[PDB]
Design a protein around this ligand. Structure first.
Ligand SMILES: [Ca+2]
Ligand SMILES: [Ca+2]
Ligand SMILES: [Ca+2]
Ligand SMILES: [Ca+2]
Ligand SMILES: [Ca+2]
Ligand SMILES: [Ca+2]
Lengths: 191, 536
C-alpha cells in the first residue's frame, strides 16, 4: 500500500491513495506530522492525564473529564457496533498517527516540536479508541450543559424575592417556553 | 457558528452555493485541519475539527456540506433523591439503588518533577454520571445525554456524509447522526437541504423542560422521537437556508436554553443579506459574512426604536438632531475600512454606551438578586429579546414597566451616553471613534487544555468563523475559495522558530483575502510545492 502526498503553497496535504484503507492511514499520518503535540494534549484532555505533564493546576479538569467519560472498554463496545469498513478506517487512521510517532521518536530533536522538549515528555502509541477520544473531547462541548440547574437557582431566588406567581412570570420572560417570533432557519409554509 | 446554503433559483449563476463558518475559537495550532482526500470513487477537500477522520467543511465530487451546533435539547439533569443515611444510594422505581462507583488514580507532576498520586471516586446513576451530590439537601444531580454511547455511531455517520453522492445517501447519514448538529447540503443539480440532527428524547408530559427532572422513575425518558420529526427541509421555496445557531423551525423547542432562540437573534444579519438581494453569488456571501463579522448586533431592533424615541423628544434636547442623523447614516458596523486602528463610525461608541446603560437600567434593580446568572440571558451573545419587548412596549408575562417608563429609560440612557462622550471625547462623532478590539490566536481552546504556544500576532476582532469556505457546485464540480487560519502546520523547531506554515494565513484572514479551493488534480498539481510517497 502506497500513497502520494502533495503539499501546496500553504502546506495543505492532498492525499492520493489506491484505496480507502491506505487513504485513511495517510490521513492520520499527515495530521500527526502537522499537529502531533496538539493531538497528544487533546487525548490527554479526554483521558484526564493533563496533570501528568502540566501539574496540579489541571487536576480538577482531569477529574471532570474522567467523571463524565467512557472507559477504554466502553469505547471498544462502541467500535464493535460499527460497520466493518468504518471501523477499519478508524483503525488505519490510528495506525497512521502511531506511524509518525514511531518515526518522530527515532529522531526527536528534528521531528518533535519544541513543546515536547520544553515540557520533557514524549508522544505515545495510538489505537482506535484514542481516535474516538479526539472526537469526544471536542464534540461533546457543543452538546453538554447544566443550564437546568442554573435556571432552578434563578427561579428559586426569584420566588424567594417576589413570591411564586410573579416569579414564574419573570421566569417565563427570562427562559420562555417558546418565542414564536424567533427567526427560524426553515418555515413549514415554504414547502 | 454560521452557515448559508443557496439553491439554484437564488444563485446568480444558477449553481447551488454553500458557506461554512464554524466558530471554535482562534488558537495556534488551529482548531481545524484542512486536507485533500482522493481515492478511487472518493474525492473530497476541506477541513474538520482537529483529530477527526473526516471533513466537516468542504465538498466532494457531488455535494458540499457544513455544520453548526444545533443547541437541541439533548442533555437533561435528573434530581436524584438521596438515602437519608447514605448519599451513594438513591430512590428509583420503588427501591433504593446503589450508585455505580469506580476509583480513578491521577498522576500529578510535582513542582519538583516528581510524580504525585491522587485517588478519587466517581458515581453514575441509571440516568448518567453524577455531577454533584448535595448531602444537606438530600439530592444528587445526574446528567443524561440522549446520545450516550452513540458517539462512535456519530463518527460513522459523518464518514458516510463524506462518501455520500446524491442526498438520499446524505439524508441517511444525517438520520444516523445522534448528537445535536445542524447539517447543510448543496449539490451540482442545484439542490440544497437542511437537517437539524440529534436524538430527541420523548419526555414526560408533566415535566418543565427548563428545570431538572425528578429521578425517582416516574418521569424518565419514554423513548426517542423518529428522525422524521426532526426539523428538515429540501429546497425551501425561498431558495436559501441560513443559520447562526438559531431556532431550526417554528415548532421546535430546546427547553433550558430557549433564551438562545428569541425574536432578537443574530442570524438576522444573514437573513437581511439574503432578503436584500434577489440573487447572490459567492462575492455576495462574503459581503454578508463581513457584515455579520463586524455588525453591532443590537442595532437591528434597538437602533430604529432609539431613533424614533429621539425624534419624538427632539425638541427636548439640542444634541438629538445631530445624534439622530449620525445614527441614521451609520451602517451599523464596527469596522476599520481604512485600517487606521479606529472604528470608522464614531456614533457606534455612543450606541455601545447607550445599550450598556439601558440594559443596566432595565434589569439591575429587578434582577439584582440573580444578576450574576441572568446577565448572560438578558444581554445574550445572540440578542436581547426581553429587553427589546420591554422597551418596545410589547407583551411580556411580567409587567416590568409601562411604555412611558421605557421611553424615559431610553432618553435618560441617551443623555448619559452623550454626557459621557462630551466629557471624555468631544462633541463630534469623529472624536468618539474607538480603537479597534484585537485578538490573537491563543494557546488554549474550548476544550480547556493548553495544546500549544499560540501566537502573538494581533488582528482585528471579528464575530466570524474560525474558517470559511465559499463553495459553488458547478456542473463540473465544486469551486471557490477558503481560508483556514492560523496556518496548516503547528510545528515549532527546537530553535524556537515556528514552521513557515504556522501562521501564514493570519493576515489573509484579517484582510479578507482567500486562497483558492483546490479539487481536481490539474489545479492541485499547479499548486504543488512537494510530492512524496508513503507506506502502510
Ligand atoms: Ca489511550
Ligand atoms: Ca442550475
Ligand atoms: Ca434538557
Ligand atoms: Ca437544476
Ligand atoms: Ca453583490
Ligand atoms: Ca478606521
Amino acid at each position: 500500500g502506497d500513497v502520494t502526498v502533495i503539499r501546496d503553497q500553504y502546506g495543505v496535504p492532498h492525499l492520493y491513495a489506491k484505496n480507502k484503507q491506505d487513504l485513511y492511514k495517510a490521513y492520520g499520518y499527515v495530521m500527526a506530522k502537522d499537529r502531533l503535540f496538539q493531538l497528544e494534549m487533546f487525548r490527554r484532555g479526554n483521558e484526564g492525564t493533563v496533570s501528568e505533564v502540566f501539574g496540579e493546576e489541571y487536576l480538577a479538569k482531569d477529574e471532570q473529564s474522567r467523571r463524565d467519560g467512557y472507559s477504554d472498554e466502553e469505547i471498544k463496545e462502541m467500535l464493535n457496533d460499527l460497520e466493518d469498513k468504518p471501523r477499519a478506517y478508524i483503525q488505519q487512521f490510528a495506525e497512521g498517527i502511531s506511524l509518525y510517532v514511531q518515526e518522530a521518536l527515532k529522531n526527536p530533536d528534528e521531528k518533535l516540536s519544541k513543546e515536547f522538549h520544553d515540557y520533557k515528555f514524549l508522544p505515545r502509541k495510538w489505537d482506535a479508541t484514542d481516535v474516538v477520544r479526539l472526537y469526544l473531547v471536542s464534540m461533546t462541548y457543543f452538546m453538554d450543559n447544566h443550564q437546568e440547574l442554573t435556571n432552578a437557582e434563578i427561579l428559586a431566588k426569584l420566588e424567594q424575592t417576589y413570591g411564586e406567581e410573579q416569579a414564574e412570570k419573570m421566569f417565563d420572560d427570562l427562559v420562555w417556553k417558546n418565542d414564536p417570533e424567533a427567526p427560524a432557519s426553515i418555515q413549514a409554509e415554504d414547502e | 457558528s454560521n452557515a448559508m446554503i443557496v439553491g439554484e433559483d437564488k444563485s446568480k449563476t444558477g449553481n447551488a452555493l454553500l458557506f461554512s463558518g464554524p466558530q471554535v475559537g482562534f488558537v495556534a495550532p488551529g482548531f481545524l485541519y484542512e486536507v485533500g482526500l482522493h481515492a478511487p470513487g472518493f474525492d473530497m477537500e476541506g477541513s474538520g475539527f482537529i483529530g477527526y477522520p473526516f471533513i466537516m467543511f468542504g465538498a466532494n465530487k457531488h455535494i458540499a456540506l457544513t455544520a453548526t451546533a444545533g443547541y437541541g435539547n439533548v442533555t437533561d439533569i435528573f434530581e436524584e433523591k438521596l438515602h437519608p443515611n447514605d448519599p451513594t444510594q438513591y430512590f428509583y422505581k420503588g427501591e433504593w439503588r446503589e450508585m455505580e462507583k469506580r476509583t480513578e488514580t491521577f498522576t500529578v507532576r510535582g513542582e519538583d518533577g516528581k510524580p504525585e498520586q491522587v485517588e478519587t471516586v466517581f458515581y453514575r446513576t441509571v440516568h448518567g454520571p453524577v455531577i454533584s451530590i448535595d448531602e444537606e439537601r438530600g439530592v444528587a444531580y445526574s446528567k443524561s445525554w440522549s446520545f450516550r454511547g452513540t458517539e462512535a455511531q456519530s463518527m460513522q455517520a459523518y464518514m458516510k456524509a463524506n462518501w455520500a453522492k446524491n442526498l438520499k445517501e446524505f439524508e441517511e447519514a444525517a438520520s444516523e447522526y445522534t448528537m445535536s448538529l445542524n447539517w447543510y447540503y448543496a449539490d451540482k443539480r442545484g439542490n440544497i437541504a437542511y437537517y437539524h440532527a440529534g436524538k430527541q428524547p420523548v419526555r414526560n408530559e408533566e415535566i418543565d423542560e427548563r428545570l431538572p427532572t425528578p429521578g425517582t422513575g416516574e418521569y424518565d425518558w419514554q423513548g426517542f422521537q423518529p428522525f422524521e420529526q426532526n426539523p428538515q427541509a429540501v429546497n425551501p421555496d425561498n431558495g436559501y437556508v441560513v443559520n447562526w445557531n438559531n431556532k431550526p423551525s417554528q415548532e421546535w423547542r430546546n427547553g433550558e436554553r430557549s433564551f438562545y432562540w428569541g425574536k432578537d437573534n443574530r442570524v438576522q444579519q444573514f437573513i437581511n443579506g439574503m432578503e436584500e438581494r434577489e440573487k447572490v453569488d459567492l462575492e455576495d456571501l462574503n459581503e454578508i459574512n463581513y457584515t455579520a463579522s463586524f455588525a453591532q448586533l443590537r442595532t437591528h431592533y434597538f437602533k430604529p426604536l432609539l431613533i424614533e424615541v429621539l425624534k419624538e423628544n427632539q425638541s427636548d434636547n439640542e444634541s438629538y438632531p445631530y445624534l439622530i442623523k449620525q445614527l441614521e447614516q451609520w451602517n451599523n458596523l464596527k469596522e476599520d475600512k481604512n485600517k487606521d486602528g479606529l472604528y470608522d463610525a464614531g456614533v457606534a461608541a455612543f450606541f455601545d454606551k447607550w445599550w450598556s446603560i439601558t440594559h443596566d437600567e432595565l434589569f439591575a434593580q429587578p434582577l439584582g438578586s440573580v444578576s450574576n446568572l441572568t446577565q448572560e440571558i438578558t444581554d445574550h451573545r445572540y440578542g436581547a429579546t426581553l429587553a427589546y419587548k420591554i422597551l418596545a412596549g410589547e407583551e411580556t408575562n411580567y409587567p416590568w414597566m409601562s411604555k412611558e417608563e421605557a421611553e424615559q429609560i431610553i432618553i435618560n440612557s441617551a443623555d448619559q451616553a452623550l454626557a459621557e462622550l462630551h466629557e471624555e471625547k468631544g462633541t463630534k462623532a469623529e472624536n468618539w471613534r474607538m480603537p479597534i478590539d484585537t485578538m490573537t490566536f491563543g494557546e488554549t481552546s474550548l476544550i480547556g487544555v493548553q495544546h500549544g504556544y499560540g501566537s502573538d500576532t494581533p488582528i482585528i476582532e471579528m464575530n466570524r468563523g474560525s474558517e470559511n469556505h465559499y463553495l459553488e457546485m458547478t456542473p463540473s464540480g465544486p469551486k471557490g475559495f477558503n481560508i483556514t487560519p492560523p496556518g496548516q502546520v503547528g510545528f515549532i523547531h527546537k530553535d524556537g522558530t515556528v514552521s513557515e506554515h504556522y501562521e501564514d494565513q493570519v493576515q489573509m484572514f484579517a484582510n479578507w483575502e482567500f486562497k483558492p479551493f483546490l479539487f481536481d488534480r490539474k489545479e492541485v498539481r499547479e499548486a504543488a510545492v512537494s510530492i512524496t510517497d508513503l507506506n502502510v
